[PDB]
Each structure stands twice: as C-alpha cells, then as structure tokens.
Ligand binder design. Structure first.
Ligand SMILES: [Zn+2]
Lengths: 285, 1084
C-alpha cells in the first residue's frame, strides 16, 4: 500500500491487485508478494484470465494491525476452489477449463495457522457467498493435496520420472527457448518439460537433438537427409557451402517431393535466387 | 517508562484539530508519567486506564493519521508492564500448602511431604482437608462398582464375543451412573433441608448402608481413623478456616464435590483460595525438592538415555542408596552400566547431610502482582505455584474460573431440570450449548461439551478448560494485555517465560508423578475393560489365544498377483518418492494376510521379506514389466528403486496383551534393535536415503503421546537413532520417525472401509476404524530440547474423517447407540484439530522465500531493541535530541564501551560510557553494510555517483540485501525516534563515507556542521536501479553505468562540469553548435 505519512483522514485501507497489469511480462515473474501494513483492512484481488497467459502464485503476508478482521475479496465463483495446508500456510486453489485452456490460480495465506488469533482474523469473500471464515472453508469445501517433486528447490536439470526440467538460480522452472552452457534448449511452454525433435516457431524451423536436447547448428544429417542450420539453428534454404562443395537446399516439393530445406539432385541447370545466378554441373555441385 | 506528553504531541501529528479523545489520551499519559508510588497496583491501574482510552480513540477514528504513533504506544505499554512486575520483589511468605480431600491420605504422599518438611524447617507445612467429606470417594467407588456389575450382567451374552465394542459397555455404564447420581442428589436435597442439619458424612453413611449394604460400624471406624491420621500430620480444616466467603465459589465447590464426585476440580478451587488467603507455595503431593546442581556434575549422560529418564534415574539412585523413602523402585536404575552405578554410589556415600543432596527453598522473590506456575512440555501446569497474599493475578485466575463455570451452568442447569435420563440430558445440553457458538468461544464450547462424562467414559477432558491450565493461560493474557475475561487467547512463549517457577527448586519427574500422568485414553480403556470381564466370569481370554505362530505359509505369488493387486481400491496421493519394505516377523495367518494386503496397496514401490523363515528369506517384488513377481536375495532391491529419497519399513507381528506393552512379536526392545542393525548393515549397500520412517503394525501396539520415553516406540527410537545416523550419512536426527498402528484397513468395491480382524475375515467396524486412524502419532527426536516429541497431526486426514462421520450420521440405517458413539467421535476429532492449532504445533515450511521473510523480521527485531537501548542511554546521560550517535566510534574497555555523540548544531563531540554490548554488535553490522554499497561505486564526479553494474546472481543478492537494510533504517519511523535520531545518524554516516573519508577521521567542528547540513538536505538513493530515479536511457559500457552523466553532459553549458567529466571519466562531446562555427570562421 502507498503510504503518505501526513495525508490526513483519508488513509487508504485497501490493496487492489489485478492479474491484468502484469500482462506481457508474466513469464518473467516468480511470485506475487502482497504485503499489508497496519491500516490494511480489505485486499481486492481481481481474478480474470482473458489478458494473461500464466498466472504466478500469490502470497498474502500476515502482519500486526489494529483491525479485528481482514477481508480477502475475490471476484470469482466459490464453486471452483479447493483448500490445502502446508506447514502453517493455508492454500486456496482455483481450477477452470475455458477454450481448451486449463486455468490454475493459487493463493497462499502465510502462517495463518500459527495460532488462534491469526487463524480467526482472516475472512474471505467470494462472489456468491460473503464472509467465509477459514474454519468454514475447512468444513464445507473439497480438499486437495499440496506436494510434488516439481515444487521442490533445485538449480539445474531434474529428471522427474520421464521428463527433464530446468530451474533458474531462484528455483523456478524455465519455459520457452533459452541458452544454457552456450547451447539452445527449448522447454515446452505449458508443461515446462524439455522438448526434442522438429519445432516450428513463428514460421522458422529448428531441430532439437534427441540425445541432449541441444539445437543443431551447421550442416547436419537427419535420417539420411542432409539439412543446413545457420548460426542460431534456424533451418536455411538456398545454395550453401558444405564440406563437399556447394549444394542446393531446396524449398518444399521442388524435386521429387523433397521436404523444405533438404538437399536435392540438380543436374546441369541454372539457378536464380533473389537475383543471384548459379550453375550446377553433373554432380549437383 | 513511556514517552512523555510533548514527544507524543510531536509524533501523533495530524492536520485536524485535537479531538476530545486525543485530549483524554494526553491527560491520562501525563497523569501516569508523574505517578510516584511504591504500591505497584496503582501504577498498573493507571496503565489500564490509559490503555482503555487509547483503544476507544483508535476504534472511533480508524482512518486517522495519528493512529500509527498511538498504536506503537499500546505496544510499549505492554512492555512497560514487565518493568512494573520486575521491581520491588520481596521474599514470599514462609508457608507450604498441600491439599488432600475426600479420603484418607496415603502413606506415600506423607513420605513425599516429610521430605519437604525436613530440609525446609523454617516453612509452615499445611495439609488442607475437608473434615466433613471423608466418605465421598467410597460413595463414588460404590456407584462405579454396582453400575459396572449391572452392565456386565446385562451384556453377559455378548461380552464373550471378541467383536465387542467396549464403547457400548461404557455408554450403558454411564447411563446407570447418571441414574444413581440423580438419586443421591435428590436424597441429599431432601435431607439437608431439615431443621437440624446433619453433616455430609452422615448423609453418605445413611445412603450407603440403606442402598449398597455397607456396614455402618465399618464406615464410622474408617472416618475416625482417617480423621486422626490427617490431624496428626499437620492437618488443617477447610471449613474451620473460613475459606469460602463468596456464595458462588461455595456453590462451585459443592457442585464439583457432591454432584459429580470430582475431587480434582475441588482441589483446584481449594488450592487457589488457599494461596489467595494465606500466600506461599502450593505443591502437589508428589513433588520432591530439587537436587543440588553440582552433585552429579561429573557423570556424563549416555547417548542412549533421554533427559527425563536421566532425572528419574538420579532420583532413583539417591532413594536406593540413602533409603529416605520406602518402596521407591529401582527399575530404570538397574539397567544402567556398572561403571555409572559405581560412580553413583561413590558420589553418594561421601554425602552425609540430607541438605547436601536436596536444595532448600530459601527466600523466593516475587512481586505483589505476579503468580508463578510450573512448566511441563512447554506449557503451564499447576503442579507448583508461588504467590504472595492477595496477589492481583490470583484474583484474575479466580475470576476466570468463576466466569467459565457460570457459562457452563447457564446451559447445563436448564437441561438437567427437565428430569430426563442420561441421553435426553445430553441432547438438550448439547443443543443449548451449540446454539450460542460464536467466533470467540467455538473451541471452548467444543471442549466443555463432555462435562457429564469426566472420569467415567474415555477421553472426557472438561477439567482442563474449566479450572485447569486454561484459566491460568487466560489470566496471563488478561494481565499482560490489560483486558479482562478473554477466552482462548494466548501469550507467546517468550512472554510466558517470565512467570516460570524456578526449575532448580522442583524435581517434577518422580515416580508417583509419572503414574499420575497417564490419561484415561483408548488403550487404558480397552485393557481395563478386559480386566473387568476376566474378573467377572473367572475365565481366560485372548484375542490370539489359538493361532499358529509356526504355519510359515510361503508367499503364493499368484494369490498376490491375480487377486490382491487388481482388487485394491486405495491409491495413495502425494509424492511417490519412497521405497516401502514389508518385513513380516511372525508366521501366523493374520501376519501373512496383512503383509500381502499392505503390499497390494502399492505394488510398484514395495518389497516383501518373510523373515519368519529365518534363513530362507528373500525379497519378492513386482518385475519391471508389471506382469510377474521377481525375487532377489534378502533385503536387496531391484535397480529401478535405488534412486528413491526416503525409506519406509513396516514390521508386522502381534503385541503382548498388557498395558504399555514391552514385547512385540516376542521380541524385546534390544532384540528388535539388533534386527534393525542387521537390516541396516545389508541395506546400506543399495540406497542412501534422506529420511527413515519405521512402523510397528499389530495388535496391542498403541501410540501414546504422554510419557513418550516410557513407551515401546520411544525406547526403540532412543536405542536405534545412533545406529541409523551412523550407517546412513545423509540422515538428520529430525528425519527419523517411528509410528505404531493396530489395525489393517482396506476399502471394498462398495466404497466402505473394512479391517482384517484377528479371526481371519474383514468386518466393517466404522467406529473402530475412525478411532484408530485418528489416534495415530509419529514420534521423532527433537534436537533443540533433546527429547522425543510427537509430531503434529495431519489436518487433512482429520477433516476427511469428520466429513465421513457427518455423512454416516445422515444415513438413517444406523441405530441410535451408534449415533451417540459417532457424535462423541466427531466432538473428539474437532477437539483434536483445535488442539493442533491452539497449542501452536504446526511447523513452518522452511524454503527460500520463507527464509528471506524470516530474515527480514529478524532484522526488524534488532532495530527496535537498539532503539529502546538508545532511548535509555540518551535519557540517562541527559543528552537531548540534537546529538547524533556515531556507530563508528565505539571503544571497548574490559567491561564498558565509550561512544562518541556529535552535536548537530556546534559539532562538539561528547563521550559516554555504557555497559550494553548491543550498541557495539549492531554498530559494526551497519558498518559492514555501507561497505558493500560503497564497494560497487566508482569515483563520483559532479557531486553525483556513477556506479558499477554486475549481472551475476552471487553478488547481486548481497547488494540488494544491503540496500534494503540500510533503506529501512533511513526510512524507519518508529516511536521513540525523537529523543534519539537514527534516521539521521545513519544518513550522515552514509553521506560521509560516500562523499568524504568518513566521520571517524573528521574532527573539525566546522567540517562536521557543513557535512551534517549537506547530508540532511541531500537525499541519497542506494537500492539498485540503472537510472537513479526517473526513466531515461541506459548506456552501460563495460561494467559502468553512464546514462545520467551522458544526459548531463549533452545540455550542461558549463565548462567545469565538462572538464570534470573529461578528466575523471573520459567523455568527449562533439559540440555541433553554429555559434562556435561562426566564431572559428571569423578567427581564421
Ligand atoms: Zn494379535
């Protein structure tokens, strides 16, 4: 909350957060850390999802204040929520399915179970029900289990049972292509598991090695077809130099239904590529 | 003391005029600040009045700007109370109280009492007794005996069925007891109302001889001998000494003594009133004086014995070698090694005087506001109490007792008045009770619901909340937080540590005390009912009287694979990161079936070992394709499980039928420890886990949560922790847990739970399943306090059990007896949840974000500590608010520290000496922080910093912590920051070390004044950004930021600034100006 020390009888008792002001940069954020002060009486959390694409876990910290009850005001339906405990923290989780997108949002109230005062002080307001205590939630809502190896703290590659994950120096999974040890890996954008094979990103094609997960660069052989990938691993089309001469890496279906970017047999014909001419002898060099 | 009036006037500033309540607060604060009296009660009442006024104002103007200051004032008032308490301490009166009501005092109690009398001869011993109630306990025993016999007779056909749920027995017995209690109450009401009043003993004697066929002459003889005994042993009569001056307390005492025969609650009231009227020290009849601190200082405690057993052993050795007390056992002492025994005897026999072994009390200093109470398991207990005559806290405790008893009676009496039987009274009481539940007394109401059953049915615990430690904790909260009549609020342990009875004077771990400590749980209930039935039919019964412990049925792989695995409906949720050994120990049919089912619950991670076939034991596990049962050598596992992080091992057997069983599968503790060692030395070849969780499964294996070190799992953990940690290097002591279960539970195809019973077939006993599930405890070794502790319960499982119970109560096919049983079980589970939250048993998560936030709070503690100390120091040496403390100039002289204060007006420096080390410890700390901000700064130019940029996560985190810590100090606006100034001392030190060579080398007062003015007027920013303040543009050359300097140089029109930037940095602009072009053209 914004603290204007001598503002007069207008000190704000509210913290208003929205999942829509971090749109765009929500892939660069670890966790959202709400910190009330003495005056905070209401915590407005506008849920939503038509704007964002990944929603970070919210943590609501418990401070001393002279208010008897602190409201957490959620604007969503109470029908989708489940609760769990972890040590002294109380976890609420919301799950929805819209447009083949799974929406999973987590709110952790920190150390609310430490004693009777903290336990009784927090109240929750859903859209169709108001003033729901934590004890009432424990008694009337469904419950889930909050523990998994993907929630631990690591700092390098992890191999959880079929699939590899990578954790930053702060212990968060990595999503999207990124460079580690001078190599371009690509971790899937939802499951965060290491991706292998052919990958077309925004109309440019890459190949990620099945052995290590590193993207190929240079002149490579794939299942008896020879491809060429530039300095960044983007597959190239054109006339390029390889250890055996100059060869044609041709567009789709130029000769005998050749795939896009494979070498082809080009005998005794001129070639024109965006204004440059070449000529290929009998041996397609 | 508190801050004075005008400093508050400055702190609590707001634009609006002073409201009336703010005037009242100022008036009360000034009135307090001048109150010169030695009677602490008046100081305390003035604090109370001030606090009430502050609360009124804060509640009326929740949005005001002054509340910040006022709120801190409240905080300070709380601390102030302690300062009042810890002054004017004086020795307690020379009195020693004990209490024994309702029967003849036993000889063992008298020996424990004489031990106190002999070494403390300057203290007046008093044994309080009730001269008109010597036959009450006999009445209670007669009621219980007759009701027990009637109930055993009524169930005589069923009681030989091993399927008997003894809760039916107990409910029937309680109905009979309630009938008889109402009978006696009506008789007493008719008798006492006569013109001539007979005493209680005469009425009890008449009723006993009339109804239960007692011999009147025997009762008279018993009364006479009891009276003469207690009279010859310092007896003091309650009724002769005029204790109950209020009618309400006398009504409570009568309700507890006569209507319920609850001698414990009567003793609670009497102990409080005796302390209130006479003052002194109250002690239980089984507390012994503290042993001298240095007597056994030379003998080292073995690693295999916990601390409590060590104290018990010391007392046993003393009482064996000196023989002060008759029949003091030596059971624990004899198991020691011979060397320790000889050291004990040597150290003892040199000591002649009893005063060389036990410590005198002497003069105990306590204030006239405080009462001190003993501590056990980290929580208060009323075993031993210290109080002056007429203490304040004693009257607080008595008001708490009276309030809780009034809320109970208000609901109980109308329910009794209808004259119904036990069940109808129960139902009406419960409804009238739970109709009034709010957010403040939910836990209290849940706890006192079982008031009618205290002492007759298992797990009734209203006494703890009515007059037990609940009243004391509530009184302490009301005291420190200056309120009245709080229910179920608590102080933090740091504040409870203030009121601790001095431990050096009390030896709580006596032998009578451990026997008093065992509770009327489910274990004792089962094993006492068995005793009743054996003694009523003169028979022999055993659950597994006729089972074969030799059948040795070999594992049928197809029975496991085609029947057990596919029929299982119980999938465990959570982390699958463990490997589960199943070690079957005994060869009967039930052990085999339980092992097979337990394997079927998780076939992929479990291995079976049939140990009973000693030499031929092999490890059977599901093959990697999931279609076949492969086998390996004993205790060996396939490769696919060697990467797991945690081990879970389950021993299966039958436990010997005795309370606190000592043999499991016919193996004592040491035999099973050898078994564990043999298992470990082979197992360590394949896996190095981080956790070990051992189970003991079988009949008669219970989980006790009191007297842990006395039970089988406690001994097992203490004996095997060293082996387990020595063999597996990665395992911490806090990662080894031991549990015990009784029943094996499965889920059928219908969705209901069934348990494999000792007769070979699975019945569906829902009450027993729920109870055994909810009662399980995991024991681990607390390394901080160095003793076994029960781990906090799983709240999710308890909530699931409660939900299942509610659904069962909706099903109307359940008969009313089971409805009553299920309702009691629901109440007990809710009480267990509330106990897990109320006693603060839930342990924090401990990961990175939680470490960060906790370090932030730990830093915020130090600042307030230092602020209070600075207020004190500056106030004593009469240094005003114009002096800034320099944390660089603290010098140590062998007991003291000299600190240099700087005047912000003249620059003159003063030197003050103090004894507090804190000022040094903190002073260097900040000194290091400004030594990291200054370690990534590169030479400044135009009175402005041009810093360095680092993009590694090793040095970026420390710099961010240093900047957050110093920024918090420079923006900290505490109360008590006006007589001292910490926002300015730190700011001036920062400015001096950033733009100069530091305050420590600057002594010229003119330089000091100019630098102080510069620092105070200039605002500095330290937390990492790229363009200090606003957004402009980032041009980071090799590890150097140059956005601000570049934007300054492209508009400066100042030759001095251009020269500085060229000389110290190297920047060179082009100067594309038309005027200069023209000038040079004319020059050429
Ligand atoms: Zn058995």
């Amino acid at each position: 909350p914004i603290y204007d020390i001598n503002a007069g009888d207008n000190i704000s008792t509210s913290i208003d957060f929205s999942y829509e002001y971090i749109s765009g940069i929500d892939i660069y954020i670890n966790k959202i850390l709400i910190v009330p002060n003495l005056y905070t009486e209401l915590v407005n959390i506008n849920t939503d999802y038509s704007s964002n694409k990944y929603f970070p876990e919210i943590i609501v910290l418990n401070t001393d204040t002279f208010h008897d009850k602190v409201n957490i005001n959620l604007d969503s339906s109470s029908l989708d929520y489940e609760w769990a405990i972890d040590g002294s923290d109380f976890i609420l989780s919301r799950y929805l399915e819209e447009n083949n997108r799974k929406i999973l949002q987590k709110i952790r109230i920190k150390d609310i179970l430490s004693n009777t005062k903290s336990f009784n002080k927090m109240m929750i307001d859903f859209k169709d029900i108001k003033n729901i205590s934590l004890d009432h939630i424990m008694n009337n809502f469904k419950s889930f289990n909050s523990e998994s190896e993907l929630d631990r703290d690591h700092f390098g590659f992890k191999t959880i049972d079929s699939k590899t994950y990578y954790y930053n120096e702060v212990g968060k999974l990595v999503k999207g292509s990124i460079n580690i040890n001078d190599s371009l890996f690509y971790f899937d954008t939802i499951e965060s598991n290491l991706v292998t094979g052919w990958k077309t990103i925004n109309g440019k094609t890459y190949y990620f090695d099945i052995n290590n997960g590193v993207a190929y660069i240079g002149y490579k052989t794939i299942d008896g077809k020879n491809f060429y990938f530039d300095g960044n691993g983007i597959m190239q089309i054109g006339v390029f130099k390889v250890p055996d001469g100059f060869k044609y890496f041709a567009p789709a279906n130029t000769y005998n239904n050749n795939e896009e970017g494979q070498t082809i047999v080009y005998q005794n014909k001129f070639l024109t590529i965006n204004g440059k001419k070449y000529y290929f002898d009998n041996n397609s060099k | 003391s508190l801050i004075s009036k005008d400093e508050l006037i400055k702190l609590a500033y707001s634009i609006k005029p002073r409201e009336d309540e703010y005037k009242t607060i100022l008036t009360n604060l000034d009135e307090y600040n001048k109150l010169v009296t030695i009677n602490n009660k008046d100081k305390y009442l003035q604090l109370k009045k001030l606090n009430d006024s502050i609360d009124i104002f804060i509640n009326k103007y929740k949005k005001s700007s002054r509340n910040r200051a006022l709120f801190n004032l409240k905080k300070d008032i709380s601390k102030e109370v302690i300062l009042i308490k810890n002054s004017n301490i004086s020795p307690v009166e020379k009195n020693l109280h004990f209490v024994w009501i309702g029967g003849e005092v036993s000889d063992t109690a008298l020996e424990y009492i004489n031990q106190w009398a002999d070494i403390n001869r300057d203290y007046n011993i008093r044994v309080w007794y009730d001269g008109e109630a010597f036959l009450v306990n006999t009445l209670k025993k007669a009621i219980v005996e007759h009701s027990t016999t009637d109930t055993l007779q009524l169930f005589e056909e069923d009681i030989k069925n091993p399927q008997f749920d003894n809760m039916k027995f107990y409910k029937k017995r309680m109905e009979f007891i309630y009938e008889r209690q109402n009978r006696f109450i009506n008789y007493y009401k008719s008798e006492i109302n006569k013109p001539i009043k007979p005493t209680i003993d005469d009425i009890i004697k008449s009723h006993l001889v009339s109804e239960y066929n007692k011999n009147s002459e025997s009762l008279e003889l018993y009364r006479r001998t009891s009276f003469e005994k207690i009279s010859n042993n310092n007896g003091v009569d309650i009724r002769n000494n005029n204790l109950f001056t209020e009618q309400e307390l006398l009504n409570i005492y009568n309700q507890e003594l006569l209507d319920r025969e609850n001698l414990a609650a009567a003793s609670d009231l009497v102990r409080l009133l005796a302390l209130k009227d006479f003052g002194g020290v109250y002690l239980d009849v089984d507390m012994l004086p503290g042993i001298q601190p240095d007597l056994f200082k030379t003998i080292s405690r073995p690693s295999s014995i916990g601390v409590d057993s060590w104290e018990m052993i010391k007392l046993e050795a003393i009482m064996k070698y000196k023989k002060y007390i008759k029949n003091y056992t030596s059971k624990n002492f004899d198991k020691l090694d011979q060397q320790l025994k000889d050291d004990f005897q040597i150290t003892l026999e040199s000591k002649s005087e009893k005063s060389e072994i036990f410590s005198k009390l002497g003069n105990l200093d306590v204030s006239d506001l405080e009462i001190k109470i003993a501590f056990a398991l980290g929580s208060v207990i009323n075993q031993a109490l210290i109080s002056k005559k007429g203490s304040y806290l004693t009257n607080l405790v008595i008001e708490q007792v009276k309030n809780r008893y009034k809320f109970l009676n208000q609901h109980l009496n109308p329910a009794i008045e209808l004259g119904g039987n036990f069940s109808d009274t129960t139902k009406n009481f419960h409804d009238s009770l739970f109709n009034s539940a709010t957010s403040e007394n939910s836990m209290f109401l849940t706890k006192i619901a079982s008031y009618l059953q205290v002492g007759f049915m298992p797990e009734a615990r209203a006494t703890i909340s009515l007059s037990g430690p609940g009243a004391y904790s509530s009184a302490y909260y009301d005291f420190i937080n200056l309120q009245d009549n709080t229910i179920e609020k608590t102080l933090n342990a740091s504040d409870l540590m203030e009121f601790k009875f001095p431990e050096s004077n009390l030896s709580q771990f006596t032998e009578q005390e451990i026997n008093s400590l065992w509770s009327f749980d489910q274990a004792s209930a089962k094993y006492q009912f068995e005793k009743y039935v054996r003694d009523y039919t003169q028979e022999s019964l055993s659950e597994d009287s006729e089972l074969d412990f030799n059948k040795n049925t070999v594992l049928d792989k197809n029975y496991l694979l085609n029947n057990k695995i596919p029929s299982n409906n119980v999938e465990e949720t959570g982390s699958k990161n463990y490997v589960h050994y199943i070690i079957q120990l005994q060869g009967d049919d039930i052990s085999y079936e339980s092992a097979c089912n337990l394997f079927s619950k998780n076939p992929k991670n479990s291995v079976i070992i049939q140990r009973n076939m000693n030499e031929s034991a092999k490890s059977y596990f599901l093959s990697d394709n999931g279609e076949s049962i492969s086998e390996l050598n004993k205790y060996r596992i396939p490769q696919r499980l060697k990467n797991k992080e945690k081990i879970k091992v389950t021993f299966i057997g039958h436990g010997k039928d005795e309370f606190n069983t000592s043999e499991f599968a016919k193996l004592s503790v040491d035999s099973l420890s050898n078994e564990i060692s043999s298992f470990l030395d082979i197992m360590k070849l394949d896996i190095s886990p981080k956790n070990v969780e051992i189970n003991l499964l079988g009949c008669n294996m219970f989980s006790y949560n009191v007297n842990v070190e006395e039970t089988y799992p406690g001994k097992l953990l203490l004996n095997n922790i060293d082996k387990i940690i020595s063999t597996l290097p990665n395992v911490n002591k806090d990662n080894i847990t031991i549990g015990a279960n009784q029943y094996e539970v499965r889920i059928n195809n219908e969705g209901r739970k069934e348990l494999l019973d000792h007769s070979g077939q699975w019945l569906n006993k829902e009450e027993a399943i729920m109870n055994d599930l909810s009662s399980k405890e995991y024991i681990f070794f607390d390394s901080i306090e160095n003793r076994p502790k029960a781990k906090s319960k799983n709240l999710i499982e308890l909530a699931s059990i409660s939900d299942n119970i509610k659904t069962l109560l909706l099903d109307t096919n359940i008969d009313p007896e089971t409805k009553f049983i299920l309702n009691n079980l629901k109440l007990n589970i809710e009480s267990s949840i509330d106990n897990n939250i109320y006693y603060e048993k839930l342990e924090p998560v401990k990961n990175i974000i939680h470490n960060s936030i906790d370090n932030l709070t730990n830093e915020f503690n130090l600042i307030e500590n230092v602020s209070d100390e600075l207020y004190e120091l500056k106030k004593i040496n009469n240094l005003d608010d114009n002096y800034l403390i320099s944390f660089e100039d603290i010098s140590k002289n062998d007991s003291t520290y000299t600190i240099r204060f700087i005047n912000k007006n003249s620059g003159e420096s003063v030197h003050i000496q103090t004894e507090k080390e804190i000022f040094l410890k903190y002073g260097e700390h900040i000194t290091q922080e400004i030594n990291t901000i200054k370690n990534n700064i590169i030479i400044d130019v135009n009175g402005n910093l041009i810093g360095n940029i680092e993009l590694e996560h090793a040095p970026q985190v420390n710099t961010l912590n240093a900047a957050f810590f110093i920024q918090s100090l420079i923006d900290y606006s505490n109360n008590k920051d006006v007589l001292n100034n910490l926002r300015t001392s730190v700011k001036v030190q920062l400015y001096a070390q950033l733009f100069s060579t530091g305050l420590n080398t600057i002594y010229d007062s003119i330089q000091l004044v100019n630098l102080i003015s510069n620092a105070i007027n200039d605002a500095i920013n330290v937390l990492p950004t790229l363009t200090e303040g606003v957004p402009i543009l980032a041009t980071i050359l090799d590890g150097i930021s140059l956005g601000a300097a570049i934007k300054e140089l492209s508009e400066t029109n100042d030759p001095l600034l251009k020269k500085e930037l060229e000389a110290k940095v190297g920047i060179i602009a082009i100067n594309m100006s038309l005027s200069l072009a023209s000038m040079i053209s004319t020059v050429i």
